[PDB]
Amino acid sequence: TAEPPGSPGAAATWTKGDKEGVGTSLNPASKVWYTLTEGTMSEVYYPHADTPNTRELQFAVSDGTSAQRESEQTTRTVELADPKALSYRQTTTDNAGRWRLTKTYVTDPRRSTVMLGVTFEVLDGGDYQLFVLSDPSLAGTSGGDTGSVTDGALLASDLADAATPVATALVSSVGFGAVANGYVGTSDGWTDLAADGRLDNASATAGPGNISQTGQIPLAAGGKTEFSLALGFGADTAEALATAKASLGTGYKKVSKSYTGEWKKYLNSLDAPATSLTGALRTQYDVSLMTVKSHEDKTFPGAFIASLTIPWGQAASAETHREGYHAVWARDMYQSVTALLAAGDEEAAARGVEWLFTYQQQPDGHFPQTSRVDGTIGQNGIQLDETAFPILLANQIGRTDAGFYRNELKPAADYLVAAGPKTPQERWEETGGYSTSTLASQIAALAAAADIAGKNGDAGSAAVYRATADEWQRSTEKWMFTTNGPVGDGKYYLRISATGNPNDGATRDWGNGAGVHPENAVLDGGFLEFVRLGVKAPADPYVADSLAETDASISQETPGGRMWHRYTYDGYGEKADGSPWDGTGIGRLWPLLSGERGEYALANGQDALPYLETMHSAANAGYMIPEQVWDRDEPTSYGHELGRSTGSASPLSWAMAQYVRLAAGVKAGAPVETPQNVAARYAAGTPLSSPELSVTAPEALSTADSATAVVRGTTNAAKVYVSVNGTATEAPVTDGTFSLDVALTGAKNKVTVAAVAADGGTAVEDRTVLYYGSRIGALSDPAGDDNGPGTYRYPTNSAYVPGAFDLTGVDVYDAGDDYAFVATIAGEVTNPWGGQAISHQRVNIYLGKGEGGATPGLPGTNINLEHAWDSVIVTDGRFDGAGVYAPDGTRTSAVSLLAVPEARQIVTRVPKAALGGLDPATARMSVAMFGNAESGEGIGNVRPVYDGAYWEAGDPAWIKEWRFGGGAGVFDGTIPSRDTDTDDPNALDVLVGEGQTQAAVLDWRAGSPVVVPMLGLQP
């Protein structure tokens, strides 16, 4: 088949993020969302709010010699065509006033079609040609598109993805006079018309690649011509065509009325807004409300994408599937449904809560950073507020039925308890630690969950949740309120602390080119969330001293009112020259933050109307509230104004929601989404008692000796609950003491003890217990023993961390089908050389029954054992040298090694059968620690020990840097031992029994080879 020139078509980008307007029908039958920019129609989403398919659709007019695009006419306007519907009207006038184009957008509520009502007026003597320019980017990619023709329509498809196939059909109410398909940059309509003012291409096909279509619209005799276009979408070309035709069959006027009617009814059925809202503030309210509703998907009701846009889209390539802002974030959704809840749309919230827990929630209980409308995980960062908000949504809505609690809510709440107070990522999705913003949601979510659990008769989980929430609520100031900050009085909440000591002045890189700055120096308004979520009283003094420094550090006065930056030094925004963000830049003013300040003001009985005025001063002529507005007096080359959209991303469903929600709060006289049961506990009047709680056993970290562990202590509380990994059991309190043998249910058990006072006050205590099975017996050994007979030295290289070869203990456990031999060292369990669990350690455990006398150990060992042995367990993660061997070097069984750094342990799983009948419960054993080494470095994979002075001398360099010293002998490459003297043991330390010393037992000067004692495990 013959193709128009240009294949595969030019590289393409997306569209300006600042949309002049957006729209979709209220009816879910129409899976179409349109956006506008630069006087053209930009991305049109379908069939999900998360899939863009278009780049630009506009008109070109020619005089037969010269041709023009409306996107280049300096004079063009945008205005919403109906104060109660998302229908916009763009107007384009020739720079020489020869013609005028008027376009009004709407969509067919019954089917997937975007419709355009157009009026073309020739104000000259006449003789003009009009053409539609449609450059699609089907299925979220500018390439892989194929355009064709059929029955006077312009077809196009991209069925590369079997999951979401996309096809379109462009149809003229008066048909086309001439059509053409082409490759962008070579044979597309504008490239053609620009050249000679004539559409020379007539190809009825093009692609696959980056193509575009153009169709001449026949004009009517006289000054103007009225017509409409129908851009239909379907899974295939036939469907798309049929659908677009049906729309034209009904007609623009009819469809238009129907589209506008649905919205008018929706608004009119919802709660009437505050009467104190001026005309403009009311229209803003209405448009912001419809916009938030428009961010809800139609295929997956209850799912809300963040924004029908792509930030700095003109610089975002469109060749590969991109996420942009058109995806589902639990946080923004929270903002959206909470705003719809404020307006009266209960259904949307119920669907929302259902979708969140059914589709986005991960099996472990937490919510992914991002997801597709169908729940397919997108970004995988861990933001604790995204697991908290859905919980708070379920709390506000009453979704608390026993089933939803057990299988949905509880796993989410358990995750928060297990995750601890530090969040890996806060709401700006950049850094972790104690976040004021996120901890606020963590506390409120847990306190709500406690009431939800209590309602469902689960008193144990309720106490764990409340105790935890209470403990974090009373630590808010200790962890994030600095008293020595380099701003104002030095007293204020900082954005986030890594260690939880707001005065340590710890530093970190804050990304986007901001560089390193102490946490003490970064201010962030996220602390206002404390009163917003009922975690602190509206008049909380800590939150109050933060205002001054925070306002001085990141706020400023725009002509529309005071606005705030996200945080100090934030660089997520345009560059100094006004150029878009490309990894680095300088963050600007975020209008939604004015709304947040408004809720804080409102909560304190102040007039929040001005904040609404500020948010609206940031909107464009279409009432779209941007994510950011310029903050400088001067206008870079890119005309930028103080307090107006930078042009990067608008609307933001979140900012649109903040406007509606604050406005609803103004009518109520208080923020309406604040969790009442939470505020009743932390922001109300009387304080609760703080019971005393002391857990004497176990210690912070311990290893059980069975499947149960003793949890005991003292308390002056009425009740005490002990919960292990989500399963709680009550501990009867007697005379201010308690003691419960709780059941362990995993390798690692997170134990939480919650005490409850008669008035409801709580205290909490966390403990971690490692489980390996029933302890058979144990052996102990002192620390700082890692020096052989007391004169050996680790090889100088850094990899050999202190205490690496220092054994502190050996515990054996019956672990079902295996024996768990757990070795404990004073040093840190490291694994740099990439071995199995470990790299440097090679411990030997000779097992026997105490028969006979002196018996040599493994080869490169250079030691004898007290009595004979039937087998040895070699724990070496290097070179696959681990397993159980017979005295003849044969490996009789494979073993598994596991490193548990937190406990400085090294676990070796040995299948019971590996010990042919030899029961570790009554067996004698010798334990020695050696340094692993390659075969060519010493026989038996044992790093040898050389003479003291020789080693100290350092010559060659690798001797003192990669070998042990303080023993005897120098290197020798001729023999397998590589040591000219093997009389001295190669063990850095062993275990001995009562009456003996490692100094004497390892004293080769008194006898060689040395004889390591054979001892038994103590129950």
Ligand SMILES: [Ca+2]
């Ligand atoms: Ca494509």
Ligand SMILES: [Ca+2]
């Ligand atoms: Ca294209």
Ligand SMILES: [Ca+2]
């Ligand atoms: Ca779930």
Ligand SMILES: [Ca+2]
């Ligand atoms: Ca030791």
Ligand SMILES: [Ca+2]
């Ligand atoms: Ca030696």
Ligand SMILES: [Ca+2]
């Ligand atoms: Ca020792």
